[PDB]
Design a protein around this nucleic acid. Sequence first.
RNA 1: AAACUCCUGAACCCGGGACGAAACCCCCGAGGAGGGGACUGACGGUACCGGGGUAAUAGCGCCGGCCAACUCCGUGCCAGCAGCCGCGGUAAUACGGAGGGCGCGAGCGUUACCCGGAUUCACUGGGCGUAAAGGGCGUGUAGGCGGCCUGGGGCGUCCCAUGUGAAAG
RNA 2: CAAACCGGAUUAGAUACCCGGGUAGUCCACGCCCUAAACGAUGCGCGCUAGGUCUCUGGGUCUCCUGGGGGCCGAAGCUAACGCG
RNA 3: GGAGGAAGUA
Lengths: 99, 151, 122, 138, 208
Amino acid sequence: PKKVLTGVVVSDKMQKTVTVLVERQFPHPLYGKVIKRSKKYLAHDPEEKYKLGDVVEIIESRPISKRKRFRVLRLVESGRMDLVEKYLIRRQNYQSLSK
Amino acid sequence: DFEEKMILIRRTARMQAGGRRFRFGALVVVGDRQGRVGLGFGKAPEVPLAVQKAGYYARRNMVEVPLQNGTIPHEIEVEFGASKIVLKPAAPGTGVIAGAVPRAILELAGVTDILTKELGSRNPINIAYATMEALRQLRTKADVERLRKGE
Amino acid sequence: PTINQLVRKGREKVRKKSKVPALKGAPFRRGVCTVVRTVTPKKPNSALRKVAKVRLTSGYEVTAYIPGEGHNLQEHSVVLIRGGRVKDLPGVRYHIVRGVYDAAGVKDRKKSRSKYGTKKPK
Amino acid sequence: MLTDPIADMLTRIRNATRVYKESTDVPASRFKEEILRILAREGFIKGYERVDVDGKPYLRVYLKYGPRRQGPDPRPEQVIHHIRRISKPGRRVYVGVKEIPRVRRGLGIAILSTSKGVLTDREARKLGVGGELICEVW
Amino acid sequence: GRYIGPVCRLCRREGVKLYLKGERCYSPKCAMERRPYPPGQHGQKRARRPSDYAVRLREKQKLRRIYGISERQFRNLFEEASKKKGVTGSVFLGLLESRLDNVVYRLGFAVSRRQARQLVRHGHITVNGRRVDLPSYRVRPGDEIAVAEKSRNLELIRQNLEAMKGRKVGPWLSLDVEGMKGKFLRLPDREDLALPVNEQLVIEFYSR
RNA sequence: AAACUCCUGAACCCGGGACGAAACCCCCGAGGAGGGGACUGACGGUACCGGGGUAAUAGCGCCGGCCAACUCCGUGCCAGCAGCCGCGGUAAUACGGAGGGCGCGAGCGUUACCCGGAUUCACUGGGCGUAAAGGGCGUGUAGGCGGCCUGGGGCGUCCCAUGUGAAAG
RNA sequence: CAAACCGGAUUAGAUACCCGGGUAGUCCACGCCCUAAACGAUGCGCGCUAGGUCUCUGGGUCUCCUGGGGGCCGAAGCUAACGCG
RNA sequence: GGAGGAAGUA
Ligand code: SF4
Ligand SMILES: [Mg+2]
Ligand SMILES: [Mg+2]
Ligand SMILES: [Mg+2]
Ligand SMILES: [Mg+2]
Ligand SMILES: [Mg+2]
Ligand SMILES: [Mg+2]
Ligand SMILES: [Mg+2]
Ligand SMILES: [Mg+2]
Ligand SMILES: [Mg+2]
Ligand SMILES: [Mg+2]
Ligand SMILES: [Mg+2]
């Protein structure tokens, strides 16, 4: 059990590093509804061939950096940018709460 | 060969050209501890007269209540007006734990053990009147087979 | 509401507030009286209730009601504090325990004595 | 937009019992028909049959009614006294075996679905398997 | 530790003959067979309707006073019955007659539990050959309740042992006069010991 | 209830006197296995045991409804009681006292706090016409939700086994 | 026409209702406040639950059928009721 | 019967 996780990337913008976004789905310990919770991980792409849109797997790996303790494992599918939007648009919804 | 228990005796008046005219109403529960119960509510211009009218009327709203080893067969919620009541039966060794009002209603049916709780408006006239209807909506293990079949 | 509105917003603890804010939360307290101006009760009454304003080690300056056949509490007199209100005293939140420090009890009494610092005679 | 249509059925039922009627047409999904299969396999209903109205597929429900009670309001003692949706789309119910709910200490029912199929309370506990509670009828 | 006060008031206050004195109890000078009304001034005066909370307190007091006991033990030995499996109302009447100060009374070594407790406490009764001077002794089955041979010769026991001779002991005990030993058989039921108590009320009491 | 007769005998007195303590050590024996022998107690002359022997502390709250338990006297919007209602404005079952009664008992009451009772933050378990509550309306992003049928993966989900879930609770 | 302002009159007095005048405003172009008894004091969307009845608007060989609306009594049901339907 | 659109003063 070195915690394999699967999630969509979010960035390809840093050297040998990407941003897997994985999703957890579970009930609510108080309400019977089954809700979503998501979390962002930073991963190790030494081949620099894991890029945006790539739906990959990650593993609880040895420490690589401060917030980088997981390795990329393998690929699931690459053609998934419509999810990156849902990250690209959400963080751009974050825009309109200011002066 | 019955048993009268008065829920409450209260006082109502009405303004009149020069004063107020009191009247009385009562809530007795006819009982027997055989399962046959009865509830009434009679209006009188004097106390020991409503008790008759209340005692009367109840000897008419007769209700056959089933008994399974000293309690209630199933679980029922019955709301009436803003007053609500929920009756979960109890294995013996429990005791009629209910409000001072419905206790009478259940006692005079032969119930020794039953779990209860008043809910919503705890006005007795609403709370009583509801309990009877709750007891009336009761069924037994036999009526289900007669309902869900018919040959 | 909706089940969805709930997980997102949720409920709030009612969080009721205290009626004895003598601080610390201690049940009793020591303080020195400062005022004794017997004031008049609320609407449906008219007596000369015996009152006193106390300043506790909590640092708060608050009135307090006095009970029984008179007393001996003067301007400078260390006292106690207690709990309980008075329907007729809009501003009296506490009470005075007697038989402790300078708040002496009540002479001549036999019914109810724990409440007035009265011992058992003969 | 008709979000939960399983409950639409259940809702169609009550408003057809509580007014006492013979037929009451309802759109048919194979999941819905399997429900009546396990509803009518008791006696709450006479039965159903795949039909077709206005060139479209529905489901006649031969609602079952108790006996004409006597006196004022001679409407018969209602069979399906109370049917209500449970696993709402706003809150879906998933339970195992060691928590399947009894219904009217037996005198009721609790219809659910699981991997071995749609089943009821006392039926599910037999298999030692549980699943998403769909409804309950007393 | 116990009541130590006026007893016949109890019997009058509850309107039931509480058999606590002893031989005077069945005599025609039982205060109830003399003054059968609640004591204290307003006895003969019209007693108004019993509040629905009243009659459930008094039966609770009946049993409380029948066995001579406080109200912590009463509660604590009631909590156990509520938790212990079985009907709450008569398991409680089981762990009660199991009390040592009771048994001796039931064995006729004394005509009064109040009388019996003293004999228990004073080093006179013996269980399984041991000097048990505890009233609150949950007597278990198959136990050897007997008057201590070191004190099986007093001018009290024999009189009250003889006083039983061939008495209808409780249908759950085994009395041997002159042998002075009485074995605890099974354990009681309300149907085995009929008392003026609707014990269910004590439940309905201790549930308010 | 008292006095009274009888009955036992908490305290008291004497005599015995512990369990907890069998090993480290020594011998035979190989410094093994095994076995044999012996010193050691603060608690404590305590517990307990044997015998003798005196009836020998009872207090607190309440008594209008909630809330079990009533009368007298003085007081006369004063003195006061009081958790909500409230009572006392002459004939008080509420104040002060007594007689008595109720509840507990080596304890009884006050105050403070936590949960409840409070379905009075409603997951079980609530509402928004007139009671506090529908945004002044529209459009619309994220999110929530979604008609019928067939096949796949089995993420949530369900079932069995195994590990863990320490001890005390 | 008319807030504010002045005068007349009623009045116990009239900083008002009644009257004689009368500025802002109400009108137009542009840009602001964005508030309400903004009320049907009833959020939007969909399905099911008897009818009778006037009317606005389409269609179909028509005191007939059907689709979209506004009113009016009322089935069951709901509410504390009024009442909704 | 319901519904819509003439008083001087404390
Ligand atoms: S039976 Fe005994 S305790 Fe009861 S009143 Fe008679 S003498 Fe007194
Ligand atoms: Mg997160
Ligand atoms: Mg309420
Ligand atoms: Mg009480
Ligand atoms: Mg006066
Ligand atoms: Mg809820
Ligand atoms: Mg109004
Ligand atoms: Mg807002
Ligand atoms: Mg384990
Ligand atoms: Mg101007
Ligand atoms: Mg501007
Ligand atoms: Mg229908």
